[PDB]
């Protein structure tokens, strides 16, 4: 078997076979040396002595509200701390990217082929004696048993952070532009070749699909008007392919950028909002530039909406998630004197960790009605009956489920959660503790340490035997959460650096793009820099209802 | 017409219309402000005082040979100088890229669509009253008149820097991996979707093509043996599509990564050498890793060959072109403490400036024979007849043509030169003086200043009228060369930053790639770090004939 199966190289040293049963570690720029890259250089000893743990940093950011209250209102200081927040994560992501499902060593194929998700950790080699390398039993526990014992919801567990359905559907809508698995190829492949925030979920992945969705007047997207309200156009009108069951009526076959978005009325709610926003921005730019044609209006509006998205994701979405008293800021300028790569490749593990199905409620509560999953799925007549205003009011008020802490995946999506485990295995993911080490975290020494709890820990010990073969995905959903928080340590520490890259590693954040002229002048630029989840709804939803990501 | 037609914004300020009749300049981070970004900030004044001209720096670098001799032998000073050479060029190239033939403004389409060549300057808008914007006559001079008067070879003008045919064909072979115009789409479109040094010209652009070229044993590429010599395999054998005239016999239809390489025996020479080199590196890796499979052997050899290519281009190829006494150095580590984007998009203007057709001789002199263009083209029999040893020996000895200085385009390729002019116009290129300013050069104030001479300048004056509408491509070929040099100032000042980006922007130069383990350990890493044009020939050509890029 492959001599690197045990993952002998530590501290991000790279393992290479040197014969049939010998390995060498490449410790270049790790700050360590020796056979396994475990002897620290003098400077590295000093660095390690002083470095505070993630949990300590979290505590500081979630306390001393008085101090942060001052920090937030002193612009120079807010900038200083945001600048640090951005650059502290920076070293953790390989960019240019490296491994993928088929390549556990660097290759031109892995670098150049955009159809793959990239990999934060190489796959376990094919001939390793054990699923995780050399540790644990001959096979991992039955995935159905893991699912049923520690993942499935008994009673609904609400998010103590107060995340609502507006938040849950925004997460789904936003991430599904870059997590778009190519199932005809396999779980390690993506259909999102842009690898980030390009808004293909609004405009289409291909030029052909974009042209079918566009009006070709005033830069606008096509739309229909039903009961005086603007919605996306039909499949019949646009000839845009969408996924719908056979029974869905013609006018309810909405055509939008992302082909799966007719599945959930929550997704169609945001699809409709963003379409209206694009056309709203077209109206503004046409006012600013009566000389511009349709093409420039369309392209400039798209850049502006990409900006709005990044702005909202940092200052509202991530802000909500963080639980910090410090106000996060979207400001590309903070990176202009720093080393940073304006590019991104979507990692498979970033997709995996974002399978936040415990967010989903037992029912979807709009106005007076409480819809089951069966009633809610593929049913856009619900969107039309209640209207967008009521959707916003209802979903703002409805609480989402806690993600970490165990036993909160609703049974209606049990097949999705099992698939997450099965596909992880199929893609030969290394263990939880390897991912923890990869992201500068201390490996868990027991199952009770992981869960902070006794009962689930015991079920997991009987299933997995060794803590060093616990799998990544189920661990994120059973993990001991931060105090009164939606996530545990592992979710945030992996999720944060992937998020920074997908947001800031957009070309619009680069110095040659981050200019007023890029967005049609100061008027366009200001739309980006004042965007919020509240203004998105206020500008595009009748009655301007109050909204936020918290109940 | 478009309010920005006159290119009013200076110093890399961006122009946008603000109504039918009005424009606004975006002066962000230019160091200038005002209506046209021409009023310098105080720090910019100080910078513009202590900034030497390109001609001054070229003079320093090509003189004081005794000082450079010492400097070259102090590894610390050499690293320092090379770090400066790298970083001084840096700021001139938009990365991530911006404009293309269809987008004179930044757009997601222009950023994301890899089928386009990018543009260092946006195209002149379609409704502009004049081809160059507002200056000059309603129509540019007839390109045939420009070609015949100032570009066509009367007698052969040898390169005073001593460039040989090894250099000329290396330039053609190397560059045609990333200059690969998509003629079905148009001159502003490319088939090189990798936008750089990926060696698709050896391995194929697509996975399907690559697999048909591969042996699937020991990481190797398929080959054939003719009279005991290793050549690329045939089209019949591989089923790999190649461009050949119908009269070419099946046995002479060589199949390589790049579709067009069968058309010049000088290209097939380098194709054969690199194929051999790949298989040589496979043998070395197999010896180091008896545990490795075919797939890893092939991939790791490809990465080593990419490293070798960049190494040779910097330390032999650019070294020669430069005429510098300072020894340039390939060392990705020099950039690890600097701001630099490990990515590249090929600019249309980089393709245009690289149309070095004056390099070509009147005849191709191999051994005792002098082959005409008609005789040399599509004729791989010449390669088989003479062999690689004699190709290398003959091409090392044969001088190439001077590129700058005028009237040196071979008549046999006149249609190609005219095409360069015509396609520039079709792609709506801005003027020579706009490109000079874009790259921090003083605009020329007359045709005589451009050429350094009187007779061609007068021809150009009567053709174009105004120096500010002189076109980029013919200007490159008539420009006054640096003393005893192959090129003038514009070629080098545009060419150098583009070359830095295509060489250093490659992912293999990034911190996470630039490690021994990427290349199969220390032995693989060392192949890259000791590669040269001479070692490439020595390892892969029978007899190890002496070679270099100059005649001497
Ligand atoms: C971020 C939170 C989130 C939410 C709230 C959410 C809400 C819901 C929801 C009800 C509203 C339903 C019925 C589902 C059902 C599914 N989800 Co999500 N999903 C979410 C995150 C994801 C992600 C990420 C993927 C992977 C996408 C991919 O790889 O293509 C996913 C994949 C799926 C898949 C398989 C993808 C495929 O094969 O096409 C199904 C089925 N699901 N989910
Ligand atoms: C760099 C030096 C160099 C050399 C030595 C060289 C040597 C030779 C050569 C040798 C006998 C022949 C027969 C040709 C002939 C041609 N060359 Co070059 N070429 C060179 C650089 C280029 C470049 C760059 C292009 C554009 C390639 C593209 O965009 O596809 C080119 C294009 C061409 C074309 C297509 C022109 C068009 O209509 O657009 C022909 C034909 N040629 N060239
Ligand atoms: C990126 O990587 C993908 C995975 O390797 C690759 O998809 C694969 O492509 C190969 C060759 O194109 C397909 O093989 C097919 O074609 C050959 C040639 O005739 C046949 O011998 C095979 O039987 C088969 O039909 C694979 O099927 C395919 N693998 C998939 C779909 O998972 C992509 O081509 C790569 N993308 C790029 C742009 O290079
Ligand atoms: C802005 O830059 C240019 C715009 O091209 C300049 O406008 C020109 O000024 C020329 C000489 O001063 C005149 O020939 C002409 O009046 C004018 N050209 C056009 C087309 O209007 C402006 O002077 C300059 N403004 C500033 C503030 O320097
Ligand atoms: C990149 O841009 C080119 C040019 O617009 C695209 O090619 C066109 O695609 C359209 C729409 O599908 C076709 O109708 C035309 O045949 C193409 N025009 C040409 C060849 O000039 C190309 O599709 C784009 N690439 C991507 C990935 O979107
Ligand atoms: C590097 O790691 C290897 C492999 O893990 C180490 O080998 C040993 O590790 C422990 C050392 O006390 C032993 O308990 C293991 O049995 C043994 N494992 C194997 C496979 O040999 C090796 O000691 C490490 N080297 C250094 C310098 O620490
Ligand atoms: C779009 C993905 C957002 C969620 C990612 C998954 C889990 C939680 C990650 C981040 C939220 C909590 C803390 C991160 C806060 C600051 C660091 C990242 C800043 C940024 O990112 O600029
Ligand atoms: C890709 C190779 C292209 C060759 C260059 C093209 C045109 C002339 C430009 C440079 C050759 C002459 C001098 C080079 C001087 C400095 C460049 C060093 C940076 C680099 O380039 O490392
Ligand atoms: C929707 C939940 C159905 C789970 C069915 C499988 C039950 C086996 O799982 C068991 O569930 C018990 C009930 O919570 C727990 O107390 C045990 O620890 C657990 O092992
Ligand atoms: C769809 O929603 C409507 C309410 O708008 C509801 O009455 C109906 O039962 C739903 N359809 C299905 C098939 O569940
Ligand atoms: C091809 O090359 C041979 C030399 O090997 C030469 O004799 C012959 O004339 C050439 N063919 C053509 C088409 O000129």
Coordinates of C-alpha atoms and ligand atoms in Angstrom, one line a residue, chain B residues 6 8 23 35-36 38, ligand 4:
Chain B
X6 CA -10.4 61.5 -28.6
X8 CA -9.0 62.6 -23.4
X23 CA -17.2 62.6 -20.6
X35 CA -10.5 66.9 -15.7
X36 CA -8.1 64.8 -17.8
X38 CA -3.0 65.6 -15.9
Ligands
LIG4 C1 -9.3 68.4 -20.7 O1 -8.5 67.8 -21.6 C2 -8.7 68.2 -22.9 C3 -9.8 67.4 -23.6 O2 -9.4 67.0 -24.8 C4 -8.9 69.8 -23.1 O3 -9.8 70.1 -24.1 C5 -9.2 70.8 -25.2 O4 -8.4 71.9 -25.0 C6 -7.7 72.2 -26.1 C7 -6.5 73.2 -25.8 O5 -6.5 73.6 -24.5 C8 -8.6 72.9 -27.2 O6 -8.2 72.5 -28.5 C9 -10.0 72.5 -27.0 O7 -10.7 73.6 -26.4 C10 -10.3 71.3 -26.2 N1 -10.7 70.2 -27.0 C11 -12.0 69.8 -27.0 C12 -12.3 68.6 -27.9 O8 -12.9 70.3 -26.3 C13 -9.2 70.6 -21.9 O9 -8.6 71.9 -21.9 C14 -8.8 69.9 -20.6 N2 -9.3 70.6 -19.4 C15 -8.5 70.9 -18.4 C16 -9.1 71.3 -17.1 O10 -7.2 70.8 -18.5

